[PDB]
Amino acid sequence: HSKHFSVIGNPFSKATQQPQIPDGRMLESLPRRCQLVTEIRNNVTVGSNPTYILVAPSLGLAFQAYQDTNVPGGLDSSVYGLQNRGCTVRANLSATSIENYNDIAKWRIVSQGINLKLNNVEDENDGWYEACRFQHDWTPDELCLRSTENDASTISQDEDLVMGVISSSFMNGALNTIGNNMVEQRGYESGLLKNIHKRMFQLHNNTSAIRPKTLQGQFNYGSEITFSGTESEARFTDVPSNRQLVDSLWHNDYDCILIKLYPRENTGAAGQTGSALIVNAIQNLELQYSPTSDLSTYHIANKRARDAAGEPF
Amino acid sequence: FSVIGNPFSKATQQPQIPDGRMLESLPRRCQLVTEIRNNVTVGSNPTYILVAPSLGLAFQAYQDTNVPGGLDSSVYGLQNRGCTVRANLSATSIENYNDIAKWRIVSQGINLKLNNVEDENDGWYEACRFQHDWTPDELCLRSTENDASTISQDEDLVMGVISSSFMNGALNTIGNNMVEQRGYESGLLKNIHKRMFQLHNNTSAIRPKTLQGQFNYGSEITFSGTESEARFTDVPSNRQLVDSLWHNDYDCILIKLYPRENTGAAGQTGSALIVNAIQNLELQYSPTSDLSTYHIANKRARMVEAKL
Amino acid sequence: FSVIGNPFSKATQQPQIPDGRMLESLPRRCQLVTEIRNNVTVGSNPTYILVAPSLGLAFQAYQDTNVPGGLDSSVYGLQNRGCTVRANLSATSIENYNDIAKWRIVSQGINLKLNNVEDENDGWYEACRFQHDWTPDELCLRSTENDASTISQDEDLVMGVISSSFMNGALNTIGNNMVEQRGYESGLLKNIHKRMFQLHNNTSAIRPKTLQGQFNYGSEITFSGTESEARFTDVPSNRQLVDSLWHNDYDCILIKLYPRENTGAAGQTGSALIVNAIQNLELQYSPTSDLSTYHIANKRARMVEAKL
Amino acid sequence: FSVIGNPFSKATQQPQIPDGRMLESLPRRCQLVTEIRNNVTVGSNPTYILVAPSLGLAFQAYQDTNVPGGLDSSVYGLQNRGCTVRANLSATSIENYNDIAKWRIVSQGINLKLNNVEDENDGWYEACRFQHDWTPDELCLRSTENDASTISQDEDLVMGVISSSFMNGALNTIGNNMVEQRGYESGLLKNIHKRMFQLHNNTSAIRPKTLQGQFNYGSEITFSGTESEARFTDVPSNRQLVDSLWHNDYDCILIKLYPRENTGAAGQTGSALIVNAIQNLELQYSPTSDLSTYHIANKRARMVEAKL
Amino acid sequence: HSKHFSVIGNPFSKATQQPQIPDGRMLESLPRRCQLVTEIRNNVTVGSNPTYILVAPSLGLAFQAYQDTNVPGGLDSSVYGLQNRGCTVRANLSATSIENYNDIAKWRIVSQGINLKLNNVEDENDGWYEACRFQHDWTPDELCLRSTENDASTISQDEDLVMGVISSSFMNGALNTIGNNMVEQRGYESGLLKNIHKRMFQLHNNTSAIRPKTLQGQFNYGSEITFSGTESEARFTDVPSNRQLVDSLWHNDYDCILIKLYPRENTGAAGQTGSALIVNAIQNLELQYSPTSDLSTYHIANKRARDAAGEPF
Amino acid sequence: FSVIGNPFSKATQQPQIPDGRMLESLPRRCQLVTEIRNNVTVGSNPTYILVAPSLGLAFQAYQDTNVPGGLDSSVYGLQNRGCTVRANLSATSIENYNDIAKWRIVSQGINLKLNNVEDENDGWYEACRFQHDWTPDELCLRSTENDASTISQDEDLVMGVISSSFMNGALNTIGNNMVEQRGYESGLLKNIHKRMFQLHNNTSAIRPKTLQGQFNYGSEITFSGTESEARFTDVPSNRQLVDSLWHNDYDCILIKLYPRENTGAAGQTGSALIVNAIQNLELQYSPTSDLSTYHIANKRARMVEAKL
């Protein structure tokens, strides 16, 4: 069980391609390492206002970034989801349901984290950051469904989806409040971007008894889920069905990480095009699949074994 | 504790799960024995038995001679042992009249014996366990009477699957992919008697389910106008009901039967099976709510005798 | 083992008698807590609390404010714990509807606490245990309802003494000669809260009493026209009924009380006692005789489905 | 671990549950001390003290002199310790303005002391603990103000039982059958000062309840036009609110009181009880949602000073 | 490479769960063992006419049976396909194409075979059989698309499909001709059904250089594919598009096996309900997946290693 | 205990000073992070940062871009963490609204990081600690808002130095004799990031300072008519105030900066510094004095319900 402990806590760890939590709460589950690499750069429209990166325990979501250069259409944040990897739900608009097309019965997170590296030339390598972890009490009308495609079109039939926060949360909602009061948050850290590659930001569990969330094959929705006519976004009201859906897609046994960025401004002028971070998100999952699924046959017995934002990457 | 035991143990069985998740709990042994037989309607097509972690359901049998009216499966309930809910139609609710506050399963299983003469002992079977991502519209309320009439006042109910799951739903899909499932086995019916089929828990931290004293419902539960069944849509109220009567900390078992055909004639009357089903429960009871039989006397003394 | 234990003791309370005389027995704890007070008609005369090894009886109290209609004693029973018989008048029999096949007592007794204010806390008592040679004409049947109506169909019954025993019968005679009796004690009522009175067995080999499902009677049991009491003559049948409801392997307890007078006025309202009777039973049950609320399906599979 | 400890014990009082189920939690001790008395309208009927695992509620008392307007029970809350939710009527939501993300109870209970003079110190009580299978229509929201006005904006709320439960509902039914319940005790009120009543957990794996920052409601919560109470129907939303304010991993305590009568006159003014409720909580907090009194300066240095 | 040789030829072989042909023609492919168990019983309507079992090298098809008790609706044969196993195509009727939803780029058959066991009581255990292998020159109008569901409904959106032969081929087409002239076929064998469990019928390759077939993501079709209004069947005309589709789904580097059955008649009378065979088909495949696929990440390097119908099962 | 520790310890830090001089004290961690930049007005002359043992002052920075109106320095307060006093102008007093009875400092320090691109990373610095014989007319009250307007009602205040001390007062004299002071160091700004500057206590017996609930003042405190500052004369009242908010059991730190010049043009915008200041306090709190939010209920029971 040594390799499992190496991966547990430390997502950036090539110890085993089969990471599981050995607590006996998921007998014969299936590991899944999902990795994503991308570039985060603050866009021109945010100006000198701070930007953000949110790492949340949502299923299939690597992270969410506010006012970077990949924001689609009229939305102010980008979702970086892990698609075509067997750990996403999709939009069965014809049946008006959220379809569990991979047939995941139960799921939890073995570990999750990001590492960021500044790649600007040394004459443009300024900017700083703060980071914290927190255990916010989410309401569904603060959350939303985003197409993993992160594109500028309405959510269409069979579109892959992940749960994110509404973009305005960064501007005037919960995440703005946390970002304005970072120093009082747990695990507070601050530093320069030129050094941020030394850090590994991993999610932490708020309990030692992490129970998997459950999912139905189809989750039928009424008018409480409003699909945008323009954006790739669907919004919730705070009603029982949306609370059930949030429970099934947002694992509340883990805390979130928020990184607030004061980057070099992006204006368009010659040497003034922002701060570019190479990002390396990883989400290590434990799944139980339903027999109808393709990935059912790869199940493997899992038998019981006997507070700072960043760590030294 | 890792895995739940075998209810048909000649050895000694633990009355409860010794983990400290249900303090001062009481064990309830529920057992049903009955003969079942594949009916004539199903002809030469296979039949099915489903054992589910559903409170008070001994098993559900697809297309046996007991099927009521137009429904295509039978349910066998343990309502005589005090572990079912009933239908309170006047108050339009599911009533928890046995005062169960919390329940889980210590062990549950089934054992079948072929009761056929020597020259009619053909047939065979496949069996497996599975963890399925149930949607509520795949489940339903069935009367434990398993009779041909509508659900009426104070009818005992169990949660089972809509009969169509067996023919073109989830159970058919599993029924056709048995040999790839976990815990697969196959054999001849004349040998099935030496097989104890037991449910497996999918977690070692089994938390009890909670029941309300009354579970109220609106139009999302449709009671059938002729049959002893009520259907669910997939809405928040019905998910909560499914969460109270179906224990998703346990997998299900599907037995697929290829029985000797029953044409309703001598020599060809199907494969009679003696079924022994046990559901060992662990219960925490709420206070008795119906004292209609009790003699409740005023505990304060009278100042003076009623004589004066 | 030699002697039974204290039901109120908080020290390793045995649920059975470890003598091997009742194999696969079950325990049953039956407790009643209530307040009582001497009434006005008894005046400055003594009152009594009898604790007897009668099946289902917590205690009998002479001349308290609860005495029904024209009877002079109150019976307090444990009918709500399913340890009684009832009147089957339409069959003219005493019905053992709780299906008790055999019974004995594991422990029994009462604890009394004075519930008067400090300037009204006078009074004293004498207490003893004894082994009277009861005759069935000294005993009677009483409705546990303890009401001023006649015994009706299915009314719960306990065997107690006739009320006139306390006044001019065996209990009065014993009450007048308490120091000669075993276990004699006396004290002030304001200190009685410290006494855990408990029945004693007069043999270390306590054999269970037996009960029939029905005990038919003739004219030897006279039901009062107006009172909730039935009387006995001394004939073989009544002796046989006495033997099944009164365990004579145990001694009785008589508590004679000399309380503050109840005249009905302010400051002269008697002595209120909070009584805490307990009767712990060891039972061998007989199979459920009433299955009117069971579902009993035919255990043989139909040959063909009903819709054919 | 197995069972929670005694909040009144002066012996190594754990501030947390050492089970690892709430990492970086914080403790919160909430204590209320007050006097109560039975009122005149209840007369010679019993009164009740309920202690429940509801968030922020010290205890609920049936028919004491503090009952607000036309309600028959008083709620006593710990709002001053920041462990409550409040009414956000202008958003039609229940506001978790104290930013509690998750909570469980470490220990809870009450101690009662009789505060009558020695010539008025009569009365007695029965006490038990139980694990009722609550339905949301038996519960309600109550303003901790405990006043005779309607629930206003930002009014602090605790979840308690509807007052009619004590009279003709589940609590009355439990109150009539106390000896059947676990932990049964009885005694005189003049001795109740010796009892440290304490809640019990019904599982050794107590998982924290969760709270949202806002809990929006529709018509399923009816606010009284005249009283400081809001009522529930049994619908999915109310069940979800019940689950966040009522920790059902714990049992409730019912104390049934038979006190000296309050007729309003001299020497007949009831039984005064000094109540010492404590609720010890383990909390995981969520980041401060209200920074209206914070100073938030821009963290980026200006390029130039303002006076230029 | 010993386990690979054990599985190659011998499909019923628990030597390795990763069987591949080590000829170097599929570098870094992915094995797939697909297994099916069912019952074949001659139905009442075929009377005393012979029945058939066809084992063909079609993708995702275990075998096809003529006039058994599972024939759906008005069709005279049953398809037993391997569904929910990552090796099937489906019917994108909305886009009017045959969709390669698992994104298989290249595929071939490592081995394929069946074993049959009679399960009638000894007083009803008569009947005999003949078997042969052959290398028929197929025309597309002899083939067709069948829903793997083998049900009595029209092919609907996203229905799983396999290639089979048209049912009438057994009655008056190529398979009737082969069945009538079995003795002249290669590998001819004949026997009693009570002994047929001793035999293992495996497909054989007609070349030592087996080249994988290729598949597109979408295969668009015109009116040359006619979907039944009633049955779960789509028929071909002999046109270029249908020849391309047949090439992509029917591997012509292997021969077919045909078993002709003379069973105990099924009439309905008491002891006269046919011959019941427990069937254990296995198809061991070698696939190359396209990167978009879920099963892409499980690719494994495959480096070069250096005539009778039945064998002793 | 000899010397106070380093607030930026990767190791584990003592929450309090373990000497027994503040029993039942509570620790308060106060931290401020912000970017500062030398302004244009100061031109090529050096700038300064002062860290003082002043309650709630994170640091004071001479001539940075945040200077308000006509004042020549900025203050950075920790008023969000509850360790400052405020201005009660209606009662003409300094109000101790956080109810601090006694306070000292466990550890206090600062860490600066140069946030400048590679071709603008010039500059250097000298630093030292000093014990100065402060006179009150060298100190002043500053608004923590650090804004361009007069001090108004309930304004949070910290004690800092008059800005002129930096240019021609005590701090300039020290600023020019840095290399003779205790704990001198110098370096390049591009290297200052690896330097933890911490205050040193000048005694090992650190006694807490006391604050009044209200500190009244007369004309000896002059509030500025345009700026957010109040000046002191040297009179007995002002010495007592300086003794309550400035802890002379600790030395100060002066960092003298020779930054890259800021002309307000691209390429020449000064030396941006990320400042991390921590003041770890040890506090003894007085009882809460503002209960405007509390619900204070009468603890005495009503004789009769308000209903009658």
Numbering used by the authors:
A (entry chain C3), E (entry chain C3): 60 to 365, 378 to 384
B (entry chain B2), C (entry chain A1), D (entry chain A1), F (entry chain B2): 64 to 371
Give the article text.
Bacilladnaviruses is one of the major group of viruses infecting eukaryotic algae. They carry a circular ssDNA genome of ~6 kb, which is partially double stranded (~700 to 800 bp) and encodes three proteins; one coat protein, one replication-associated protein (Rep), and a third protein with unknown function. We present the capsid structure of the bacilladnavirus Chaetoceros tenuissimus DNA virus type II (CtenDNAV-II), determined at 2.4-Å resolution. The capsid protein contains the widespread virus jelly-roll fold but has additional unique features; a third β-sheet and a long C-terminal tail.
